[PDB]
Design a protein around this motif. Structure first.
Motif, PDB file in Angstrom:
ATOM      1  N   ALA A  22      45.028 -12.588  -7.603  1.00  0.00           N
ATOM      2  CA  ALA A  22      44.067 -12.956  -8.639  1.00  0.00           C
ATOM      3  C   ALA A  22      44.407 -14.321  -9.241  1.00  0.00           C
ATOM      4  O   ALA A  22      43.531 -15.024  -9.747  1.00  0.00           O
ATOM      5  N   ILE A  23      45.686 -14.687  -9.189  1.00  0.00           N
ATOM      6  CA  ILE A  23      46.131 -15.965  -9.742  1.00  0.00           C
ATOM      7  C   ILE A  23      46.368 -16.974  -8.619  1.00  0.00           C
ATOM      8  O   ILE A  23      46.536 -16.604  -7.459  1.00  0.00           O
ATOM      9  N   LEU A  24      46.358 -18.254  -8.969  1.00  0.00           N
ATOM     10  CA  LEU A  24      46.553 -19.305  -7.971  1.00  0.00           C
ATOM     11  C   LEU A  24      47.703 -20.238  -8.338  1.00  0.00           C
ATOM     12  O   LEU A  24      48.461 -20.679  -7.473  1.00  0.00           O
ATOM     13  N   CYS A  25      47.810 -20.561  -9.620  1.00  0.00           N
ATOM     14  CA  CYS A  25      48.858 -21.475 -10.077  1.00  0.00           C
ATOM     15  C   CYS A  25      49.154 -21.236 -11.564  1.00  0.00           C
ATOM     16  O   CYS A  25      48.317 -20.718 -12.299  1.00  0.00           O
TER      17      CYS A  25
ATOM     18  N   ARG B 294      38.355 -17.454  -9.946  1.00  0.00           N
ATOM     19  CA  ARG B 294      37.062 -17.326 -10.619  1.00  0.00           C
ATOM     20  C   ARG B 294      36.558 -18.688 -11.110  1.00  0.00           C
ATOM     21  O   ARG B 294      35.361 -18.880 -11.319  1.00  0.00           O
ATOM     22  N   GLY B 295      37.485 -19.630 -11.292  1.00  0.00           N
ATOM     23  CA  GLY B 295      37.116 -20.964 -11.759  1.00  0.00           C
ATOM     24  C   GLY B 295      37.497 -21.139 -13.223  1.00  0.00           C
ATOM     25  O   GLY B 295      36.744 -21.709 -14.013  1.00  0.00           O
ATOM     26  N   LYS B 296      38.677 -20.637 -13.576  1.00  0.00           N
ATOM     27  CA  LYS B 296      39.153 -20.738 -14.953  1.00  0.00           C
ATOM     28  C   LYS B 296      40.666 -20.550 -15.010  1.00  0.00           C
ATOM     29  O   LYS B 296      41.333 -20.461 -13.978  1.00  0.00           O
ATOM     30  N   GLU B 297      41.203 -20.494 -16.227  1.00  0.00           N
ATOM     31  CA  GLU B 297      42.640 -20.316 -16.410  1.00  0.00           C
ATOM     32  C   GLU B 297      42.920 -19.095 -17.277  1.00  0.00           C
ATOM     33  O   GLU B 297      42.034 -18.579 -17.958  1.00  0.00           O
TER      34      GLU B 297
END
Length: 74
Positions: free
Chosen positions: A24-27, A46-49
């Motif tokens: 679910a997380i990228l960075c 999703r395009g958010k943090e």
């Protein structure tokens, strides 16, 4: 207009204390001292943090694989 900062923003209310996986997380990336108690943030697909502390525990395994996000423009 065009005075304050649109991105970045301040801390959050609900952090990623749950068992959020890498799927679910990228960075991840630490935030300013606005939190006044270890301010951390992440990036998702999703395009958010997402907001977090810093050394919660599940962040280590996320930051052990991932690293500080590059650039500062999303």
């Amino acid at each position: 207009s065009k005075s304050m900062q649109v991105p970045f923003s301040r801390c959050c209310f609900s952090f990623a204390e749950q068992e959020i996986p890498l799927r679910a997380i990228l960075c991840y990336r630490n935030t300013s001292s606005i939190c006044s108690n270890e301010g951390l943030i992440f990036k998702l697909k999703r395009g958010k943090e997402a907001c977090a502390l810093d050394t919660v525990g599940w962040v280590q395994r996320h930051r052990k694989m991932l690293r500080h996000c590059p650039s500062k423009r999303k």
